[PDB]
Write a protein that binds this ligand. Structure first.
Ligand SMILES: [Mg+2]
Ligand SMILES: [Zn+2]
Ligand SMILES: [Zn+2]
Ligand SMILES: [Zn+2]
Lengths: 196, 49, 485, 66, 263, 113, 97, 61, 194, 140, 133
RNA sequence: CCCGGUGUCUUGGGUG
C-alpha cells in the first residue's frame, strides 16, 4: 500500500526459498533497491509493526499523527525473543549455508491489481483488415496489429536500415499494384489481365 | 470535477492550494491529463443544502 | 496512415528481467513463437530439415504453418489432412515457426533515440513475458513495473542481414550522443560487485570452483590463490579478473592517491588482472573511459558483449551466497548524533530570526539587482538549504561501513547523499514555483498560524525526518511541493 | 471467504481450528492467548487465523435461488 | 560414522540432532522430505451436484488440500505407470461425499469427516481422512443452508510435492546449527554491541560458548545440525525421516545404474 | 497458457537420456556430465562428497536456468584415475552413509517409543 | 559589467568598453550588428550553455550541425512552419509537417 | 470422421482419467480440449476412450 | 570527418605548463652533454654528441613544436583547456605496445634518431580523410587533421619515445601502423543520416 | 461548521494538547515546532483529529506521515484497482466484469478511519510474508 | 634459493575500516632505510606491534593450473606460517639510494623500500612472500 | 467442392 508495485519475475518451490531458523519461508520477496531512493520508510515500519502485532495477537494502530514511535514498537519486539529491528538470520535454500547478511523479514499487506499478463499478451501474423484502408485493424479484441508510428520511422533512419523500413511499410502491410499511363501520368488505366 | 479542460497546461488550477486544507484530499488525484483538476472530498467534508 | 500505420508480424506483452540470458538475447513466449513466422526459402541444403517441420504441423513446436508455391497459392496446414503427402520443390517457401538465433527488432515506446530499437536474438522459453538481460533496461528506459514492449519480425533474407549487421545490440554499446557507453552493470550486480571486490573479501576453495565454472569464456585454468598457507584463499578481485579479457590496461586516479592506496580507491588494471581498487560505478558504470568503453576499443563489440554476461553471472552467484538486505535499523542514527543534528537545525532557526530582525529594523544589506523582500527571501533560502546539507553530512559520517543504506549510496546503484539526509536527519525546505510556500490564506499559509509570520515552520520548513514522522502542518506543505512535481 | 485449509507460508493445517478459536473468544480469552492454546507458534500460522474475515456467513443470508 | 540423538519425539513431530555429516547431506535431507517423499492426495473431483454458495472449483480446490493417510503408499503405483485402462483398484482411491440441509433454519456445516472411502487397494491402510481424535470433526469444507446440497465424487492419487504442494508430507522444517557462530559464517549487524542485540538460539545451552582468548579454528567445519520435522498427519514423523533417506537412496542408485549401463 | 506441465520436472521423455557424458578435450582427463530432470538436491550432495576425495582436482556444477530442471557438472581428475569411475565411488560412499544413518535412527527411535 | 535590456551597437561605441569582445544573449540583435558568422558562434554558445547547465554533455558535432542548418540561408530560419516550409523541398515532404 | 465434438476419456498417459472434447481430428493425432486446464492438447488415437450408449467404448461406435 | 562513437577525451601534450617545464621535456642538446639524452637508453650514444647535422633535425622538430604551442594557445584554445575529444587514442596504443614486446627493463635501444623524426613526419601525410591530388583537396585534407597532427607530435617526441615509452625498432614501426589503421577506421561512413 | 470563507478569520489549534503550554530529548521521536513568533496565542477552534484531512483512498495507507508525496498519490490511484469482494451479493448481480479474491484477509496494520470505511469487513488483499533481500537476481 | 631475506620489526598495525585486514609497517633490524609496508589477513596470522618477522621473497616454491597440494610432495612453504602469491606492478628506479617495489597480492598490497644492491634481483613477473613466526 | 468474413463515429476512466 505504499506505491511499491511490481511484477512476478520467477517462481520458486518451497524448498529453494531462504528460510529462517524456525523454518518460516517468505511467501513473496522484494528488492532492497526499491527503498532508499523512493524513501517509503512507512513500508518498513509497517512490516516491523505487523511482526509485533502477529506475535502478541492484535492489529496495531497505524493511524497517522499519533504518539506511536519506532522505539516503542522495537522494545515490545525484543521482549518476545526476536531481534529489535526486525532482522532474522536466514539460510540459503540451495546449500544450507548461512547468508553472511541478515534479512529484514515479516508480514506486509499486499494487494492484487487488475493488470494480468494474459489480458495483455498479443500477437498477429496475418488477419482482418479495415475495409477503407486495407490495413490491419486496431485492437486486441479484433486480432489487431501494433502501430509503427512516426517515432519508430525515425529510429530506422538513424540506424540507416533503409531496406528494412521499406519492407515494413509495404510487403508486411498494405502493398498494392497500380497501373499508370506513360504519357499523362494518371492512374487511369483500364487493365483486363485475362484479356491482356 | 473542475471543467476547465485538458488544453492549456497552466500553473494554477491543477495545483494544491492552501485553502484546500480539510476540504479536499491533498493526496488523492489521478495521474495524467486530469491531474489536479479532479479532486476528492476529505472524510469529514459536507456540502451545504 | 502514411507517416505511420499498423503493421503485421508484431507482438506485445509485459517484460521481465533475466540475468541468465546473454546481452543480445530476448526470451520469447512459446505461444507468441507459434503465431509469428518467417518465410524461409527451400534450398538443397535445408530441404530435409524443412520437411521435418512440415510433418509436425502448426500445433507442435518446432513446426510450420504454410507452404507457398511460386504461383502464390498458400496451403493452410491447419486443414490439410493429407499433410504427409507433400513433397517440397526447390524455390517454394515454408513459413516456419520462430526459432533459435532468429534476429528480431525489439522496441519500447516512446522511441526517443535510436537505441529504443535494437535487434535481439530470440530464445524460446515457457511463460508469458518477454525476457531481457538486465543490462539493456537503461537504453530502453525500461523497468518491470508493468511496462510493455513490442517485437517485430523481419520477413526476408535481406532484412535479417540488415538487422544483424547494423542494428544488433553489441554495435550499440557506445552511443554517438556523448561518445560514451549507454549500458553498464546495474542494480543488484553493481551493488554486489562493490561488496565482492572489497579488500577483505575472501572465498574458500570449494566455492571458487563453482564460480570459475559459471564463466562461459573460462579457459579451464584455475588461478593460484592469493593465500597459500595455512589455508588456500582467493580474493574477490582475482575471480572478477577471470571475466576480464587479457591485454586490457586502465589507470585512474581518485583524489591524488598513491600506488599504496590507503583508502582502497582508484583503479589499476594490468593484463586483464585487477591490481588494486574497489570496483564501483566509476569503473563498470556507464561513464566515459570506464571498463566497458575500454574493452570495446581494444577487442570489438563481440568480446565486449560477453563482458556483460560474464560479470553478471559471477557476481549474482557470489551475491546469492553472501546475501544483502535493508531494514528499519539502517535509517536510525544513534542518540549522540541526533543531538548534533538537532543543534544544527536549532541554530539555523535562530539565524533566520536574526535575519527577520535585521530586515524589519532596516539593518539588512541589499543584494544587487534585488528589492528588500527578494533579498530577504533569498538569504533565508540559502541558510535553510545549507542547514539541511550540514545536518545531512553529520548523519552520513556517523554511519558505519556495514550499514546497508551506505553500501548502496557508495556503490552508486541507487540513492545519493540527499536520500540519507532526508530519511535520517531532515527533509528540509519545500519549494513551490521556485519560491517558499505562498500566503494562500490572507497573510498566512495555514489557519493554524497567526498573520505576518515569516518563521521557518510557517513557510514550509519540514524539520522532522521521514523516520521521525511529519507533523500535520509539515505534511500538507510536503504534499504541495510533491503535487507540483 | 472461508478459513483456508493450509497456512500459505509454511503449510501447517489450520482449517480445523476455526471453530475452536471462536469458542475461546466467548470465554474471554485474548487473541494472543487463544492462538497460544491452539499451539500455533510460528507467526506465519498466526496471521491465518487472526486476520481471516468470515464472509461466508454473509453470503448464506441470500435466499437459495433453487 | 553418522550419529543421531533424538531430543524430543511425538506422533507428528520429531526434534533431533544430526551429527558427523556434511552440511550438504543435512540440506539434501531437508529438501527431500519437503519435495520428494510421496503421499496420497485428491486429484480429480467429479461434481454431480453443487447448489451451495461456493463456486465449484473453489470447493474442489479445498478438497485437494485435505491430508489423507498415506502409510502404505510405497506399494502403490503411480497412475502414469499403470498398465490398466482408465483407473482401477491398484492406482487410485475413490472417495465420496454427500451432504444436505433439511429444515428452514440453521446451518449445516460440511466437514472432512463426512468423506467416505468407497474403493481402494485391498488391505492397504491408505485413503483415510486424517483425524486427531475420534470426536474431532476435522476440516471445514463448506456451509449449507436450506435446500442446498453438495454431492461429489473424489479420486485420490499418489504424487510428489514437485508437481503440486498439496502432496507435501511436511509443513515447516526448523533447521539450524552453530548457535554461537564459532564458524563465523555470518557477520552480525549491530548498532552498539552485537552480543546484547541479538537473541539467543533455543539451542544455546546445548553447545558451550567461545572462549574470549580462544584462537580462530580455520579448520573447523559444521558438524552438528539440529532439525525438527513437523508433519500434517498424512504420514507419521518417523516414517517421513525414514522414507526421506530411502527415497534419496534410490535417486543415487538410479544415477549409479546409468553409468554402468552407458558403456 | 504458457505454463509448462509441472510433472515435466521429474518425468523423462523417451528420446532424452537421464545422463549424458561428453569429453572436454581442451584439457586432459575432463568430462562434462549433463543431468536431466534433476535439481540442486542431487547435485550438491554429489559435489561436496567428490571434493573431499584426494584424486579429484576439479568439481563444479551449475543449474543454468531454474525454469528447466537440469544441471551440468564438470569433473576433472588427475592422470591415474578415470573421472567416470571416481563418480561411481562417490555414489557408493553416500549410499553407504545413508544406509548407516537410517539404521542408527531406527535404533534410537524404538528407545523413545 | 552585465546589463538588463537589449542594446549592442550603442554600447560598443562607448569609450572604456572593450569594443572587440562585447556579447549579447539575443542572437537576433547580433545578426543585425555583427553578421551571420558571428551569429553562428553566438547561437552555439547559447545552446551549449543550456545543455551543459544540468551537467549533461553533448558532443560538439550535433549542436554544430543544428546551427549550420539554422544559418545556411543567411538569415535565421526558425524551427517552426514559417521557417521550415519556406524551403524549395518537395510538396509531399513539406505537407507532412 | 464421426468422432469430432463427442466427449472422451483418456485411458493412458499423464492425463489418464480426464474428460475432454475432440476439437480437431486431422489424422492419428487428435486435439482434445481437456475440461480441466484451459488448453487443447495434441494426443495419439491409441490413448482415447469414447462415450457411447453403454459406458466408454472404442472408436467402433 | 569523424564518427561520434570513435572519439575520447585526450590531453594535448603541448598546451599546459611553463616554457621552462616544456623545454625540459622536449629539448635535445647534442652539445651540452648534461642536457642530452641519457646514455643508458641508447646503444649508439657515442656517435651522438657534437653531431651538428643531427642537431639540424632536432632543431626543426622543436621549432615545429613551438609553432603548434603558439598556434593552439593563442588561436584555438584561448582559455587553456587541454583535455578535448579527439580520435585515435595514443596513450592506450603505446601501453599495449609495451605489453606485446615486453618493453620493460633497463636495456639500451637500437632505435636511431633519424628513424624517429622521419617516421613521425611521414605518418602525418598518410592520415587520409579525402583522396585526390587537386590543390584544394590537399589544403582541406591538411586542415581537417591539423589538431590531431599536433596531438601525435606532442606524444611521439624524441625524448618521450626514448626515455619514457622506451620503444625499440619492432614496436615503433608497429605503433605507426596501428595509428594509421585506426584513424581510417574512425572516419564517418558515407550514407550516415547525421 | 465552518466553510472556506469563515476559516480565514479563525485561529485553529492542531491538537487539544496545544491549547496549554507544557513543562523530552528522546532522539527517536519527532520534534514539535517552537512557535515563538507570537508571545501569546488566542485559539478559537480545535481540530477533531488531523488525520481527517485525508480522503477515502488515502485513509487506507498505514503511516502516510512517513512517506513521500508521490507515493501517497500513487497508492490512492492503485487502491481503486485492487481485487476485493465489492459486494456480498455478487452471485445475483450480472455485471460486465467482476473479480473476487478467494481468501481476503484484514490487514495487520490498520487505521482508525478504516472502521467507518468497513475495510476490515470487506478487505481487498492478503498478508504476505515478505523478505527484503537480494536473492538470485530475478528481482532486480 | 631465494631472492631476498631479512627480519623486520613491526612499528604500526592499523586495522582501520576493515575487520580482517591490517596494514603493517616495518624496518629491517640490520639495515635502516629498508622499509616494508604490507597488508595481511588478521584472522589467519595475527600480528602485534614490535613483533619480529622473517620475510623471504622467492620466485618459485620448488626446492600453471593450481591443484590441491599432495601431502607427499615438499616445497619451500613447509617451513613458514603465512605465504602469499602476487604480481609486481611497479619497479621504481629511484634517484640515488631509494628503490621501491610495489606488488599486489590480489589487492592486498605490499610496498618494499630499500637499496639497489639488496633488491636488484626482484625485477620479476611474480613473487611469493613467505613470513616466519 | 474448393475459397470463406463484419463494423463506423464520440464520451468517461486507467496504464507507462
Ligand atoms: Mg515503468
Ligand atoms: Zn494517359
Ligand atoms: Zn504458518
Ligand atoms: Zn491402476
Amino acid at each position: 500500500r505504499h506505491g511499491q508495485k511490481g511484477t512476478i519475475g520467477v517462481t520458486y518451490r518451497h524448498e529453494d526459498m531462504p528460510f529462517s531458523a524456525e523454518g518460516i519461508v517468505p511467501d513473496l520477496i522484494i528488492n532492497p533497491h526499491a527503498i532508499p531512493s523512493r524513501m517509503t520508510v512507512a513500508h518498513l515500519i509497517e512490516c516491523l509493526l505487523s511482526k509485533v502485532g502477529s506475535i502478541r495477537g492484535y492489529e496495531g494502530d497505524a493511524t497517522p499523527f499519533t504518539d506511536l514511535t519506532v522505539d516503542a514498537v522495537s522494545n515490545l519486539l525484543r521482549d518476545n525473543g526476536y531481534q529489535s529491528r526486525g532482522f532474522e538470520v536466514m539460510y540459503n535454500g540451495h546449500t544450507g549455508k548461512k547468508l553472511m547478511a541478515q534479512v529484514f523479514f515479516g508480514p506486509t499487506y499486499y494487494q492484487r491489481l487488475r493488470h494480468m499478463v494474459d489480458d495483455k499478451i498479443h500477437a498477429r501474423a496475418r488477419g482482418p483488415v479495415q475495409v477503407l484502408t486495407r490495413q490491419p485493424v486496431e485492437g486486441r479484441s479484433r486480432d489487431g496489429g501494433l502501430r509503427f508510428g512516426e517515432m519508430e520511422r525515425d529510429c530506422m533512419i538513424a540506424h540507416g536500415a533503409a531496406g528494412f523500413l521499406k519492407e515494413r511499410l509495404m510487403e508486411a502491410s498494405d502493398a498494392f499494384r497500380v497501373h499508370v499511363c506513360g504519357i499523362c501520368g494518371l492512374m487511369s488505366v483500364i487493365a483486363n489481365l485475362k484479356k491482356n | 470535477n473542475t471543467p476547465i479542460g485538458r488544453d492549456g497546461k497552466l500553473a494554477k488550477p491543477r495545483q494544491l492550494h492552501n485553502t484546500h486544507w480539510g476540504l479536499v484530499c491533498p493526496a488523492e488525484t489521478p495521474e495524467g491529463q486530469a491531474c489536479g483538476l479532479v479532486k476528492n472530498l476529505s472524510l469529514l467534508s459536507g456540502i451545504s443544502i | 496512415n502514411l507517416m505511420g500505420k499498423r503493421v503485421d508480424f508484431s507482438a506485445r506483452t509485459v517484460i521481465s528481467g533475466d540475468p541468465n540470458l546473454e546481452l543480445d538475447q530476448v526470451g520469447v513466449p512459446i505461444s507468441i513463437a507459434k503465431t509469428l513466422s518467417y518465410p524461409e526459402t527451400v534450398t538443397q541444403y535445408n530441404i530435409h530439415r524443412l520437411t521435418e517441420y512440415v510433418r509436425n504441423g502448426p500445433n507442435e513446436h518446432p513446426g510450420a504453418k504454410y507452404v507457398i508455391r511460386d504461383n502464390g497459392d498458400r496451403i493452410d496446414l491447419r486443414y490439410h489432412k493429407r499433410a504427409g503427402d507433400i513433397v517440397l520443390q526447390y524455390g517454394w517457401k515454408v513459413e516456419r515457426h520462430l526459432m533459435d538465433d532468429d534476429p528480431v527488432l525489439f522496441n519500447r515506446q516512446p522511441s526517443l533515440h535510436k537505441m529504443s530499437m535494437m535487434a535481439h536474438r530470440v530464445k524460446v522459453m515457457p511463460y508469458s513475458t518477454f525476457r531481457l538481460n538486465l543490462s539493456v533496461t537503461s537504453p530502453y528506459n525500461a523497468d518491470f513495473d508493468g511496462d510493455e514492449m513490442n517485437l517485430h519480425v523481419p520477413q526476408s533474407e535481406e532484412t535479417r542481414a540488415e538487422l544483424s549487421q547494423l542494428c544488433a545490440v553489441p554495435l550499440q554499446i557506445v552511443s554517438p550522443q556523448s561518445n560514451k557507453p549507454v549500458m553498464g552493470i546495474v542494480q543488484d550486480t553493481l551493488c554486489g560487485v562493490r561488496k565482492m571486490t572489497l579488500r577483505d573479501t575472501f572465498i574458500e576453495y570449494e566455492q571458487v570452483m563453482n564460480m570459475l565454472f559459471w564463466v562461459p569464456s573460462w579457459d579451464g585454468v584455475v588461478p593460484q590463490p592469493a593465500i597459500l598457507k595455512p589455508k588456500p584463499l582467493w580474493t574477490g578481485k582475482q575471480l572478477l579478473s577471470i571475466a576480464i579479457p587479457s591485454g586490457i590496461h586502465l589507470q585512474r586516479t581518485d583524489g591524488g592517491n598513491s600506488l599504496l592506496s590507503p583508502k582502497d580507491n582508484g583503479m589499476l588494471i594490468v593484463d586483464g588482472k585487477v591490481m588494486f581498487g574497489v570496483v564501483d560505478k566509476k569503473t563498470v558504470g556507464s561513464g566515459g573511459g570506464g571498463l566497458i568503453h575500454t574493452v570495446m576499443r581494444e577487442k570489438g563489440p563481440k568480446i565486449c558483449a560477453e563482458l556483460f554476461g560474464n560479470i553478471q553471472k559471477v557476481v549474482n552467484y557470489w551475491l546469492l551466497h553472501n546475501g544483502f538486505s535493508i531494514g528499519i535499523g539502517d535509517a536510525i542514527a544513534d542518540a549522540s548524533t541526533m543531538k548534533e543534528i538537532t543543534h544544527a537545525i536549532s541554530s539555523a532557526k535562530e539565524q533566520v530570526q536574526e535575519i527577520i530582525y535585521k530586515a524589519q529594523h532596516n539593518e539588512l544589506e541589499l543584494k544587487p539587482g534585488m528589492t528588500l523582500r527578494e533579498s530577504f527571501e533569498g538569504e533565508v533560502s540559502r541558510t535553510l538549504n545549507d542547514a539541511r546539507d550540514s545536518a545531512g553530512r553529520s548523519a552520513e559520517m556517523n554511519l558505519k561501513d556495514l550499514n546497508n543504506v551506505k553500501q548502496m549510496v557508495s556503490a552508486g546503484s541507487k540513492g545519493s547523499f540527499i536520500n540519507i539526509a532526508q530519511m535520517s536527519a531532515c527533509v528540509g525546505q519545500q519549494m513551490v514555483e521556485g519560491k517558499r510556500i505562498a500566503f494562500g490564506f490572507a497573510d498566512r499559509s495555514l489557519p493554524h498560524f497567526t498573520k505576518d509570520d515569516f518563521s521557518p515552520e510557517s513557510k514550509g520548513f519540514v524539520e522532522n525526518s521521514y523516520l521521525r514522522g511529519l507533523t500535520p502542518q509539515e505534511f500538507f506543505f510536503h504534499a504541495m511541493a510533491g503535487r507540483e512535481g | 471467504m472461508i478459513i483456508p485449509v493450509r497456512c500459505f507460508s509454511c503449510g501447517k493445517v489450520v482449517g480445523d481450528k476455526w471453530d475452536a478459536y471462536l469458542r475461546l473468544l466467548e470465554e474471554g480469552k485474548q487473541e494472543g492467548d487463544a492462538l497460544d492454546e491452539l499451539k500455533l507458534k510460528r507467526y506465519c500460522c498466526r496471521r491465518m487465523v487472526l486476520t481471516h474475515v468470515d464472509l461466508i456467513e454473509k453470503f448464506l443470508r441470500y435466499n437459495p435461488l433453487e | 560414522e553418522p550419529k543421531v540423538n533424538i531430543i524430543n519425539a511425538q506422533d507428528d513431530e520429531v526434534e533431533l540432532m544430526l551429527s558427523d555429516v556434511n552440511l550438504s547431506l543435512a540440506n539434501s535431507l531437508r529438501r527431500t522430505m519437503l519435495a520428494e517423499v510421496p503421499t496420497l492426495a485428491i486429484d480429480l473431483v467429479e461434481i454431480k451436484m453443487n447448489t451451495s454458495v461456493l463456486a465449484d472449483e473453489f470447493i474442489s480446490h479445498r478438497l485437494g488440500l485435505i491430508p489423507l493417510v498415506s502409510e502404505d503408499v510405497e506399494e502403490m503405483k503411480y497412475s502414469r505407470d499403470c498398465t490398466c485402462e482408465d483407473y482401477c483398484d491398484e492406482c487410485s482411491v475413490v472417495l465420496e461425499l454427500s451432504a444436505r440441509h433439511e429444515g428452514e433454519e440453521g446451518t449445516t456445516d460440511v466437514y472432512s469427516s463426512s468423506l467416505i472411502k468407497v474403493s481402494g487397494p485391498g488391505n492397504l491402510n491408505v485413503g483415510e481422512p486424517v483425524r486427531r481424535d475420534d470426536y474431532d470433526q476435522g476440516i471445514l469444507l463448506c456451509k449449507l443452508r436450506n435446500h442446498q446440497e453438495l454431492n461429489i465424487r473424489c479420486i485420490a492419487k499418489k504424487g510428489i510435492a514437485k508437481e503440486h504442494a498439496k502432496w507435501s508430507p511436511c509443513s515447516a522444517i526448523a533447521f539450524e546449527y552453530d548457535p554461537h557462530n564459532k564458524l563465523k559464517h555470518t557477520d552480525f549487524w549491530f548498532e552498539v554491541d552485537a552480543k546484547k542485540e541479538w537473541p539467543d538460539s533455543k539451542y544455546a545451552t546445548w553447545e558451550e560458548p567461545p572462549k574470549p582468548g580462544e584462537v580462530f579454528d580455520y579448520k573447523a567445519k559444521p558438524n552438528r545440525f539440529y532439525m525438527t520435522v513437523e508433519t500434517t498427519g498424512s504420514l507419521k514423523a518417523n516414517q517421513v525421516f525414514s522414507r526421506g533417506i530411502k527415497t534419496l537412496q534410490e535417486k543415487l542408485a538410479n544415477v549409479l545404474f546409468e553409468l554402468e549401463n552407458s558403456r | 497458457m504458457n505454463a509448462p506441465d509441472r510433472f515435466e520436472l521429474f518425468i523423462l521423455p523417451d528420446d532424452v537420456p537421464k545422463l549424458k557424458i561428453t569429453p572436454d578435450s581442451r584439457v586432459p582427463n575432463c568430462i562434462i556430465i549433463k543431468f536431466e530432470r534433476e535439481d540442486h538436491t542431487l547435485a550438491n550432495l554429489l559435489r561436496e562428497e567428490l571434493a573431499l576425495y584426494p584424486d579429484v582436482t576439479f568439481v563444479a556444477y551449475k543449474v543454468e536456468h531454474p525454469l528447466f530442471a537440469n544441471f551440468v557438472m564438470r569433473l576433472q581428475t588427475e592422470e591415474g584415475t578415470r573421472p567416470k569411475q571416481a563418480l561411481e565411488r562417490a555414489c557408493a560412499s553416500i549410499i553407504n552413509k545413508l544406509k548407516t544413518l537410517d539404521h542408527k535412527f531406527n535404533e534410537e527411535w524404538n528407545i523413545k517409543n | 559589467l552585465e546589463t538588463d535590456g537589449i542594446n549592442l551597437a550603442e554600447v560598443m561605441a562607448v569609450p572604456g568598453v572593450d569594443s572587440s569582445r562585447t556579447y549579447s544573449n539575443s542572437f537576433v540583435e547580433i545578426l543585425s550588428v555583427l553578421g551571420i558568422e558571428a551569429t553562428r558562434s553566438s547561437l552555439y554558445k547559447e545552446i551549449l550553455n543550456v545543455i551543459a547547465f544540468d551537467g549533461s554533455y553533448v558532443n560538439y558535432r550535433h549542436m554544430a550541425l543544428l546551427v549550420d542548418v539554422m544559418t545556411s540561408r543567411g538569415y535565421l530560419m526558425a524551427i517552426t512552419r514559417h521557417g521550415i516550409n519556406r524551403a524549395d523541398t518537395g510538396a509531399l515532404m513539406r505537407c507532412s509537417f | 470422421d464421426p468422432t469430432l465434438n463427442k466427449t472422451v476419456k483418456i485411458r493412458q498417459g499423464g492425463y489418464k482419467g480426464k474428460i475432454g472434447i475432440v476439437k480437431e481430428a486431422n489424422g492419428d493425432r487428435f486435439r482434445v480440449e481437456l475440461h480441466n486446464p484451459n488448453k487443447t492438447i495434441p494426443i495419439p488415437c491409441s490413448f482415447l476412450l469414447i462415450e457411447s450408449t453403454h459406458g466408454w467404448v472404442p472408436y467402433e461406435d | 570527418g569523424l564518427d561520434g562513437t570513435q572519439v575520447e577525451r585526450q590531453t594535448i601534450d603541448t598546451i599546459p605548463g611553463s616554457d621552462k617545464a616544456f623545454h625540459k621535456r622536449y629539448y635535445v642538446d647534442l652539445m651540452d652533454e648534461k642536457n642530452s639524452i641519457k646514455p643508458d637508453v641508447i646503444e649508439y650514444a657515442a656517435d651522438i654528441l657534437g653531431d651538428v647535422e643531427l642537431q639540424k633535425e632536432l632543431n626543426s622538430e622543436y621549432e615545429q613544436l613551438v609553432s603548434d604551442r603558439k598556434f593552439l594557445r593563442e588561436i584555438v584554445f584561448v582559455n587553456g583547456d587541454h583535455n578535448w575529444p579527439l580520435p585515435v587514442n595514443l596513450r592506450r596504443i603505446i601501453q599495449n605496445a609495451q605489453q606485446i614486446f615486453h618493453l620493460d627493463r633497463a636495456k639500451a635501444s637500437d632505435l636511431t634518431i633519424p628513424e624517429i623524426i622521419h617516421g613521425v613526419r611521414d605518418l602525418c601525410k598518410k592520415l587520409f580523410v579525402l583522396r585526390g591530388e587537386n590543390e584544394l583537396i590537399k589544403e582541406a585534407q591538411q586542415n581537417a587533421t591539423s589538431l590531431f597532427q599536433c596531438l601525435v607530435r606532442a606524444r611521439l617526441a624524441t625524448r618521450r619515445i626514448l626515455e619514457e615509452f622506451r620503444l625499440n625498432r619492432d614496436a615503433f614501426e608497429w605503433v605507426l601502423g596501428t595509428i594509421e589503421a585506426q584513424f581510417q577506421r574512425s572516419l564517418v561512413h558515407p550514407g550516415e543520416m547525421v | 461548521y465552518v466553510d472556506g470563507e469563515e476559516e480565514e478569520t479563525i485561529m485553529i489549534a492542531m491538537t487539544p494538547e496545544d491549547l496549554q503550554t507544557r513543562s523530552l530529548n528522546d532522539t527517536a521521536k519527532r520534534i514539535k515546532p517552537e512557535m515563538s513568533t507570537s508571545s501569546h496565542h488566542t485559539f478559537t477552534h480545535c481540530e477533531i483529529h488531523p488525520s481527517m484531512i485525508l480522503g477515502v483512498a488515502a485513509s487506507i495507507i498505514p503511516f502516510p506521515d512517513h512517506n513521500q508525496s508521490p507515493r501517497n498519490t500513487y497508492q490512492s490511484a492503485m487502491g481503486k484497482q485492487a481485487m476485493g469482494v465489492f459486494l456480498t451479493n455478487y452471485n445475483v448481480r450480472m455485471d460486465t466484469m467482476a473479480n473476487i479474491l478467494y481468501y481476503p484477509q484484514k490487514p495487520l496494520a490498520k487505521t482508525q478511519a478504516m472502521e467507518y470505511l468497513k475495510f476490515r469487513e470487506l478487505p481487498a488483499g492478503q498478508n504476505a510474508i515478505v523478505a527484503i533481500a537480494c536473492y538470485s537476481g530475478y528481482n532486480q | 634459493s631465494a631472492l631476498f631475506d631479512d627480519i623486520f620489526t613491526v612499528q604500526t598495525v592499523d586495522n582501520g575500516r576493515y575487520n580482517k585486514v591490517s596494514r603493517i609497517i616495518g624496518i629491517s633490524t640490520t639495515n635502516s632505510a629498508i622499509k616494508l609496508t604490507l597488508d595481511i589477513n588478521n584472522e589467519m596470522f595475527p600480528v602485534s606491534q614490535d613483533d619480529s618477522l622473517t620475510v623471504t621473497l622467492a620466485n618459485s616454491l620448488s626446492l600453471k593450473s593450481w591443484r590441491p597440494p599432495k601431502p607427499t610432495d615438499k616445497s619451500l612453504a613447509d617451513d613458514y606460517d603465512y605465504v602469499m602469491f602476487g604480481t609486481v606492478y611497479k619497479f621504481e628506479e629511484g634517484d640515488e639510494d631509494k628503490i621501491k617495489v610495489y606488488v599486489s597480492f590480489g589487492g592486498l598490497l605490499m610496498c618494499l623500500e630499500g637499496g639497489y644492491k639488496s633488491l636488484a634481483s626482484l625485477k620479476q613477473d611474480n613473487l611469493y612472500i613467505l613470513i616466519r613466526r
